[PDB]
Amino acid sequence: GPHSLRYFVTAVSRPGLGEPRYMEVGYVDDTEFVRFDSDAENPRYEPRARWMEQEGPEYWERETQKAKGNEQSFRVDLRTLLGYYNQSKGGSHTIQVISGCEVGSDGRLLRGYQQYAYDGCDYIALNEDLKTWTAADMAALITKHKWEQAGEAERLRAYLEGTCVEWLRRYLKNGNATLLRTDSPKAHVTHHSRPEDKVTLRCWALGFYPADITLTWQLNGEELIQDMELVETRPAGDGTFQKWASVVVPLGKEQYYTCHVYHQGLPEPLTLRW
């Protein structure tokens, strides 16, 4: 299947409390593998997955130097934006960035992207052509004109198509035992009373990897997608994932509803009853 390398960056100002909080978090697929946090006692880029032990000390030194440089650029950005939006120095503000690339099972590039937000709203983004930018407001249009005259897109494209892809392949190779594994979901159904002669049926899926899964409830061969409550698939603390899906059904009629679990670790989908 496909794979991704993604870097989530966040800078948060805190007036009266010193410099902004700055964080970078890297993911290969849905697994955290590196992180930088400016609030650490000695801020360094650090491994977050076991297989990153295969990188030498030069790797960590280089990533740490990038992070400290990036941190400074976002401090300046935070100042600049107060001018752009005529905001006071007293309020806290947030920059977010997502950068990444995705490859097929053969290692070839599928797509690359970079998108930015200010205070939780789109600011500027690289278009799918990887040549032009798209800006959400007047402030972002200033930024766009700057990046165009500096040729920033060309530099970014070279990273997304070359460096990003090549390192993703390396991490997939180095982290093969972790990243290319499949852990099959284990499923069960719980039952809870409600008022008015109705019952909540909840189907659980536990201990699975990778994160992509489908949980559906059925009554007589039709899916009850519109009547389901769900949680977003969520990490379980040990590198695996879990999810649940519920439906409200008439008391006494529980036996007619079935939960269906689809996952790459399930040659045939699971079918469960209460």
């Binding site: 960056v9 990533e63 650029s73 600049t80 500027i124």
Partner: peptide, 9 residues
């Protein structure tokens, strides 16, 4: 391998 340059806004 993280992006090493985010251009100033």
């Amino acid at each position: 391998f993280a992006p090493g340059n985010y251009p100033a806004w």
